[PDB]
Paper text:
The U2 snRNP has a bipartite organization, exhibiting a smaller U2 3′ module and a larger U2 5′ module. In this work, by employing FR901464 analogs as molecular tools to dissect the splicing pathway, we elucidate how spliceostatins/sudemycins interfere with prespliceosome assembly and splicing commitment by covalent coupling to a reactive zinc finger of PHF5A.
We have engineered a variant of the human SF3B core that lacks the β-propeller BPB domain of SF3B3 (SF3BΔBPB). Our best orthorhombic crystals diffracted X-rays to a resolution of 2.3 Å, while diffraction data for the trigonal form was limited to ~3.0 Å. Strikingly, SSA’s epoxide group resides close to C26-PHF5A—one of the four cysteine residues of PHF5A’s Znf1 zinc cluster. The electron density is continuous between C26-PHF5A and the epoxide group, while absent between C26-PHF5A and Znf1’s zinc ion, indicating an intermolecular covalent bond between SSA and C26-PHF5A. Although C26-PHF5A is no longer within coordination distance from the zinc ion, the anomalous difference density shows that the metal is not ejected from PHF5A upon covalent modification of Znf1. Concomitantly, a water molecule likely replaces C26-PHF5A from the coordination sphere of the zinc atom, resulting in a configuration reminiscent of the active sites of zinc enzymes (e.g., carbonic anhydrase or alcohol dehydrogenase), where a water molecule and three side chains coordinate the zinc atom. The zinc atom serves a catalytic role in raising the nucleophilicity of C26-PHF5A by deprotonating the thiol group. The resulting thiolate anion attacks and opens the epoxy ring to form a thioether bond, while K29-PHF5A contributes to stabilizing the leaving group.
Residue numbers in the entry:
A (entry chain A): -1 to 441, 773 to 826, 831 to 1197
B (entry chain C): 463 to 1304
C (entry chain D): 6 to 98
D (entry chain B): 15 to 79
Write the structure that this text describes.
Amino acid sequence: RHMFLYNLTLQRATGISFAIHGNFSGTKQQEIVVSRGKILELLRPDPNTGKVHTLLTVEVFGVIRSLMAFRLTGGTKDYIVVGSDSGRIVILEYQPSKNMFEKIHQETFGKSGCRRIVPGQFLAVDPKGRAVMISAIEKQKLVYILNRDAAARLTISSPLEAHKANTLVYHVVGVDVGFENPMFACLEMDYEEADNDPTGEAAANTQQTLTFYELDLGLNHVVRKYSEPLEEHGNFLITVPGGSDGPSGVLICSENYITYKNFGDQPDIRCPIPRRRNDLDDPERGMIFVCSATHKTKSMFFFLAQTEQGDIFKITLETDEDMVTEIRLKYFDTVPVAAAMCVLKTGFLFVASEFGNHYLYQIAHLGDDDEEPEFSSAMPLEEGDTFFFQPRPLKNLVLVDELDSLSPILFCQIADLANEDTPQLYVACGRGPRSSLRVLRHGVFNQVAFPLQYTPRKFVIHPESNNLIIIETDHNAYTEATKAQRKQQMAEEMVEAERELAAEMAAAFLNENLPESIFGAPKAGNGQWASVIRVMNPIQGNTLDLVQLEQNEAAFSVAVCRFSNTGEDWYVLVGVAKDLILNPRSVAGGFVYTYKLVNNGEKLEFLHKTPVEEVPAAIAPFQGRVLIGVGKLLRVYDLGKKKLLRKCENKHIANYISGIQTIGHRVIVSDVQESFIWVRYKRNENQLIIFADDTYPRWVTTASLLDYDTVAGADKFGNICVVRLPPNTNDEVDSQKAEVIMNYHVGETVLSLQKTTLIPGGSESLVYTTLSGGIGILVPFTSHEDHDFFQHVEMHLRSEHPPLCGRDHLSFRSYYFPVKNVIDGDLCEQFNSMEPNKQKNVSEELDRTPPEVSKKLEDIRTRY
Amino acid sequence: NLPFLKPDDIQYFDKLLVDVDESTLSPEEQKERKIMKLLLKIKNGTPPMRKAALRQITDKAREFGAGPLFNQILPLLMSPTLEDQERHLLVKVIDRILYKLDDLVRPYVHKILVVIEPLLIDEDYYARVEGREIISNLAKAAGLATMISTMRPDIDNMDEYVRNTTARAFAVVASALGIPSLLPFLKAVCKSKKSWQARHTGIKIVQQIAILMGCAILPHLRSLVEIIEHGLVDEQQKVRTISALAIAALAEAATPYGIESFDSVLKPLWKGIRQHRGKGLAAFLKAIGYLIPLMDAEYANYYTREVMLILIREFQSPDEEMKKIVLKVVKQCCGTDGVEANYIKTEILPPFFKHFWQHRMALDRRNYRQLVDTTVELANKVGAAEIISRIVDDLKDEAEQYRKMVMETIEKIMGNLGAADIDHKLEEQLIDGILYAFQEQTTEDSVMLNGFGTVVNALGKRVKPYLPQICGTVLWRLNNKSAKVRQQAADLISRTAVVMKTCQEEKLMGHLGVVLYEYLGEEYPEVLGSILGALKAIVNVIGMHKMTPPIKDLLPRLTPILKNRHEKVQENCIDLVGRIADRGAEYVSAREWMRICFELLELLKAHKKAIRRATVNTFGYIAKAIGPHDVLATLLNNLKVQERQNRVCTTVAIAIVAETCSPFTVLPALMNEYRVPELNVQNGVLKSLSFLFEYIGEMGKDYIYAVTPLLEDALMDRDLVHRQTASAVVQHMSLGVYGFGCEDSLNHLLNYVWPNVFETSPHVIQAVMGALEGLRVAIGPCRMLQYCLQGLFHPARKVRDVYWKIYNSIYIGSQDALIAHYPRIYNDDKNTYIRYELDYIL
Amino acid sequence: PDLIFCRKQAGVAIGRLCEKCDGKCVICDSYVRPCTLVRICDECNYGSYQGRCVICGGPGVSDAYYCKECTIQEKDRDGCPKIVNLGSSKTDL
Amino acid sequence: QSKYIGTGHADTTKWEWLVNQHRDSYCSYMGHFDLLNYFAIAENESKARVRFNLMEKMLQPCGPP
Ligand SMILES: *C[C@]1(O)C[C@@](C)(OC)O[C@H](/C=C/C(C)=C/C[C@@H]2O[C@H](C)[C@H](NC(=O)/C=C\[C@H](C)OC(C)=O)C[C@@H]2C)[C@H]1O
Ligand SMILES: [Zn+2]
Ligand SMILES: [Zn+2]
Ligand SMILES: [Zn+2]
């Protein structure tokens, strides 16, 4: 009845949003600090074995938005500066003896949450560790001065204001100006003029500026020195070394361009980004860099810039009399799109991909010896003309390690399909050509992965054969047929230009297929789509059947059902949308493809397609007939020999339907913006009637009915709610408001919820799987004694062991709605991580011993 | 108009007294008039006047010109009657005008320096800080070349005082503009051929740069050392001395990094150790002592073995500065890794204790502290027994200062290390010497008390054989005629109670306790507080059942002592009564406890937070002992009878009882006290509920439903104070049960709080806004936004004002959450208003 | 009298309170549950104002703390809590 | 109250409040990692490209007044 839950993360988030490298141990070994989102991890790649070992993992109970390392003059261990959602700046030092992060400094300045004017999003540091700037998206910018003391302990100062009203920051970076006054380059833009002109001229004429904030240490104040308008809007900045190690300045990466700028008499040196030879994407589409990496050596230095397609270019600069001459670009390699790249010493490269697994390669050859074309800014070029290069497999990098990553999980179902006593977790995840369906078994989690064509959206299990029916949909992607057609049209255009050599080149280009899994699927066309239906055996992962779809058709719903009008034959309906152009949302129509599952769920045959007004986003079987959510309309459809007939419908759903789940004679509609709506359908009279809604709106992503009068839902903002209809609720009434009995904030957008039991014989639990790669569970309480005990544990952990990045745990778990009857077990299990004194004190507060509390936590762990 | 003028201000603002007319006087005089007005508004104005005058004087500094501006400012800055904050304001306006003026101050630089430089030698630390700040801003405004050209002629002056002044100012400009800018000037001047005064001044500049910038000089430490090293072999002795002193300053500022920078200095210093004598020898020794903590272990051992011969030789030096230098150098050497403990024990300790530990050193306070710290640092490495055994027999000396010195040394040694290194003979020597030094005290030396306590607690159970002797001595000193000796004995009992209890000697402790009972009621407040603390310690460590005197006879003696006015006696008596109530309530009747509680209600309004906390703790203990019912009935009677000045104490006591004995024994009676139609007692019940919920916080998660009807009756009662206090109750409830599943009762109370937002009185609307923010925290910003949207855009202007005020409160409260709570607003023919990203479906 | 808060960007200075207001919240005048430590800006702690009372401006004896209610509502992020009088000068006491 | 940008008065227009909330939402998308993940999956764009597009929209999120 009463829902008192206990949250426990079984599988930590494996995605990565930030990755830095440095000597955080204080020795010659180089380690890597990464951010999984709400988790700070410290990894160490062993150069001998070439494998990455995880040394520390801490749940910070916040939202890490900026992460960077620095060192003071004469130091031997890099510190860690973290920008969070806390309105606090945090500096930490890893201690290998105790194996933990020690909070060296924590300075407050603003309010909590990822706010728009409160700093935390952007973090720059002076290359000599003398100062660190923390900036927001708007106006507010703060500069802290760092120093040492007698015992070589880091000391921080009061913040210096550097705000400027109506100023949007694109990127901040510290400039290497040797041991001069520290400086920070900012990609800014002033919008004051835009909002005061109703013609729109000011917005089109206001251009992005590059400004320099100089921190005078003698006068001890920050001044906005220089500010130069930029030609085209740059997307991020790179610090080129200065002082005695380089010529200083900044590198700006924009659309189809990279520029070098520096204050003084130094001119601007721009260079166009080389485009892929015989590129398959839309010509109107631009090309930018997604991340960067800098490697300094006693001799020289270089940069690594990865494009949207995944091509890594090595960049060097020519200098004469401390003045740059040109920008030399050379195709280095091609790996999946990374959020951060770390070029470590001892010849290695750690690549943390934005989605999918991460990799660690070995740098064998720098690449200068190769005959491959090097491009420069001094080369003449027409304004529209850009360079061209040929991509090829790995030549300078050799993969020495791969780190598994479940992110991004788009759907998950827990079921026993291998006929073992313990069920397995079937997780459809991955993005684009790197998507996959993975089977997870515990007995930590062991996993196996079967690749997929595109990004999966949903999948259902066939009860008579346990085979999976996957739908894979991607936006602005190209179908196989249209891909071949584009290749053929390009080959036709190639010969119209020596003609014997052109035909040979066209034939060689036609006969060569770059693997999309490693080279990125050539996807373009803002209005185009790509969808594929697939059948797969869950034991060996063999594709039993595959159906490609039309160029402008996007699948969004799937279900396997038996119809009353027919026998026990199995049908499969797939809802599809045509010409879906989102933001601004516009659509033509929708179709529902119907197939007949034959040969005990091994292949399907096309029956008929049923057209419909808008997008059929949800399909749920309702005993004899079926239920379909087309736009804001919820209809019942009966199977006809020709098409699908609408026997009844309701059109009072306020907004777009995203999911539909039915139990008994009831059906739960999941609005995109509003919460759940309860509809009852009498067999007689044939009409769906709305009889209950919610008092709070919720951006629902998935749901799972727990019993007849309850439901549990996941939010778009990383929340989990559990609501329940009031007692004595009849279905023949018009207005009912559902009571919210549980609210919780996980910090990661949950996309799958399911009530099940992992280990047979254990307590029933509620498993959730989120978009960030994590898997968690909620366990209900049995007795009030255990509930009060764990509640007191949570209370004392909130005060004695506060979150690492200055966030308030009770506020973090109440990000959008206040916590209601959920105990955070990830905070409780940190009892074993405290010092013995605090453990003894808190245990004496609860009238027991630290080992007894550890044993209780381990009992909860083994229960599940 | 014009602000107030002090007498000493007249001299600087006489022309502003007469209300003359403009254009009559010269235009140059009109400039001086406005400068006077601006400076008067800055110096003796309100914050808004000061801000406006600062903005005005900065936006017209170029028009005014440096000449008259500084000719008016500088006399005011050096007024003998100028306040420190006035000086700070003048420094700030000087900084601002210097930033605005820039190169216009070049002709006036000298004229400013001769005024500012005295501040660099003033005894006031902040005066020197302000002088350095002014010189920094001036150097940034005038430029490096101007400062060098203006300050160069004073380099070779034969005053030796203006030389130090110029060196300090050059260090200031170096910290202002950076070391590299002044590096060429220093490299040129330190190698001057004209005279040795220029070399001395440049090396003093390096020294002052180190002293001023500290760790910031590490990037340029190599350059500074290479510029300054040549002075160690110069013919002038003063320049060699200043070279060594600046090397020591560079080493101190670079601790512990950068030893490779001093590579070209090790052998010169090592040879000068054997060569030079006198003040140059002391400077070389100081530089070496500050350089040693930067070296590796083996090289530290090598260098220390090389210099230790001359160190031991200079141990017996007549110059007191030399003795201080060698003592600091020894403390630095024996505190580094590399100098073996056996080496210090063999070669350093005998001459150290022979020449340094002499009676005369116990007279001068500086030598006292230096030798004590050095000896404690020596014990920190060579061992506690190796050091204590050499000075323990001196605990029975005739000179009291030497006994104080050795006692403090032993105390610090045993407090930092312990007693595991002490043998039996040394333990007996320590006991005998401590007893002799305590029995032979002229005054009340707190160091003797600290040493006795430290040694006793370090010995632990090993002091049991000497416990009868120590107890007899404490008895003899407790009976002393002087009261301060009695207080010191009581403090010694308070510090050794636990050790005496662990030794299993409860009879001696009971005798001490009965003697303290006899001496209770002492007129002197400090002695009374000390004996109360001693009794508290004895009662806490001994059993209440076997405690002599019995608690039955002890607590009634403590009852009237709470009426004392001295805060120490109050706190000690309260703590003792609380211990008695905690672990010995069975020996006291309920009437005595009730009288104690009624005498304890005043101490809840004390100014001393320690007294408040102690009173709260003891009241909670007594409530746990007796029970909530009788005390709560008496407290409700008091609340009904007493006047509004003593009702806050009753409210706090009610909250204490409700938190100690669970609120379900207090809330029913408190809510029942509301039925009487008297308005003052209803307000009192409301205030009691408000403070009770604020005090219990999370504990009131099971009681919001019970009090909701009383609130909803008071929320709409046609009385202002009723609604105000009820909104306060709602706010404290919401903040207390925040996150514990009270959304139902709180969302109900919101509907009774909301009608009171359209109120004109400020005192009630403030509590209403507080309740609304508390409910925003407890229920969430979503419900608050739902209630605000219906009036955010209303034709009525006052309705819009109020709803936008509430919306601003909610927005400042939680801005990131509102993104998930904003409603839908469809687009029109001109603008796009729907957020399409949030409409994506996977 | 016209009193107000400073609300400037606070720094590393610790706010203090005198003997009259020991352990009292500077924002809401509460005496219950001291939570977070008070920070003030450099201007209110410079010179002879170092370690001075935040409310009245006298010799401070204890550290000033916000209360739990102000901590929960994040009223400690608003700025410098130093009470300032707009009808007096720097020399006025 | 220029200290807090999103605050309002009785003369705050609908366009002003909506562009304020649009900029708030864009900065929240920039902050919360999983929100950006969802947007980059649905739109099939690299996270850098989504962030760049959002920062570009930050100029006039609702259009001219
Ligand atoms: C800053 C001031 O406003 C200055 C001045 C002159 O203002 C008039 O003096 C104020 C002092 C006020 C005092 C000392 C009020 C006494 C109150 O006593 C009632 C009974 C309350 N007592 C408690 O709350 C007691 C204990 C609490 C529960 O626990 C702790 C640890 O305090 C409140 C007042 C203390 C001064 O503030
Ligand atoms: Zn202030
Ligand atoms: Zn005060
Ligand atoms: Zn407060």
